[PDB]
From a paper:
We also reported that the TYMV papain-like cysteine PRO domain involved in the proteolytic processing of the viral replication precursor protein, also displays a DUB activity that was able to rescue the viral polymerase from degradation. The structure of the recombinant TYMV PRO/DUB domain we solved previously (residues 728–879 of the TYMV replication precursor protein) highlighted its homology with members of the ovarian tumor domain-containing (OTU) superfamily of DUBs. In addition, the TYMV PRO/DUB structure displayed a surprisingly exposed and minimal catalytic site, with a Cys783-His869 catalytic dyad instead of the conserved OTU DUB Cys-His-Asp/Asn catalytic triad. The structures reported herein reveal that the loop harboring the 865-GPP-867 motif is a highly mobile flap on the otherwise rigid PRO/DUB framework a result that is confirmed by molecular dynamics simulations.
In order to get an atomic view of a conformation of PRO/DUB not constrained by the crystal-induced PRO:PRO interaction, we generated a recombinant mutant harbouring deletion of the five C-terminal residues (hereafter ΔC5), corresponding to residues 728–874 of the TYMV 206K polyprotein. The ΔC5 crystal contains two molecules per asymmetric unit, hereafter referred to as molecules 'A' and 'B'. Clear electron density is present for residues 730–874 of molecule 'A', and 732–874 of molecule 'B'. Both molecules have their C-termini far from the catalytic sites of other molecules in the crystal packing. We thus have two independent views of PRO/DUB not engaged as a substrate in a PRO:PRO complex. Superimposition of molecules 'A' and 'B' of the ΔC5 mutant with the WT (engaged) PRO/DUB shows that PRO/DUB retains the same conformation in all three environments, with the exception of loop 864–868. In molecule 'B', Pro866 at the tip of the loop moves by 9 Å to a position overhanging the catalytic cleft. In fact, in molecule 'B', the mobility of this loop leads to the closure of a hydrophobic zipper between Pro866 and Pro867 on one side, and Leu820 and Leu781 across the catalytic cleft on the other side. His869 and Cys783 also come significantly closer together. However, it is clear that, in this closed conformation, His869 is now close enough to abstract a proton from Cys783. In summary, the crystal structure of ΔC5 indicates that, while TYMV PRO/DUB is a rigid molecule, it harbours a very mobile loop, 864-TGPPS-868, that can shift the GPP flap at its tip with its atypical double cis-proline, from an "open" state where it can be recognized by another PRO molecule, to two other states: a "closed" one where it forms half of a hydrophobic zipper, and an "intermediate" one, halfway in between.
Numbering used by the authors: 730 to 874
The structure:
Amino acid sequence: QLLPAPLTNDPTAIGPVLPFEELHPRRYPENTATFLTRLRSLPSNHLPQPTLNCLLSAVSDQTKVSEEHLWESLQTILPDSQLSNEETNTLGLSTEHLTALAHLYNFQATVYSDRGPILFGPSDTIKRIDITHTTGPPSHFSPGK
């Protein structure tokens, strides 16, 4: 809810800090797309692929989209500060990145977590995928049920 300084300082973005679902309206499952972000304006800087890439490999398996294309798509819609930071380098990508990918590639994911299945991504979509998540630690995403 509070405004993150790296986000407001991020020169790849413009405008005010708003929930993802306000800046990118879709039929998201409630309380999944409320995370704060800013509109991405600068073209891609071609960030290196994340070292902890299991979310990309899992979504890639289920969509047949390369991890490179998934990652470049994330750079179309999210500020760089939300893609390369202390958290992504030590914990990997998160279900918030999954929500962003779900918008960019029009799918809804069922995430089979240690707490049960949870939907991420817009309902106004045709494509469905299955992703497994274990808390660990470490966090791990895998494709399929």
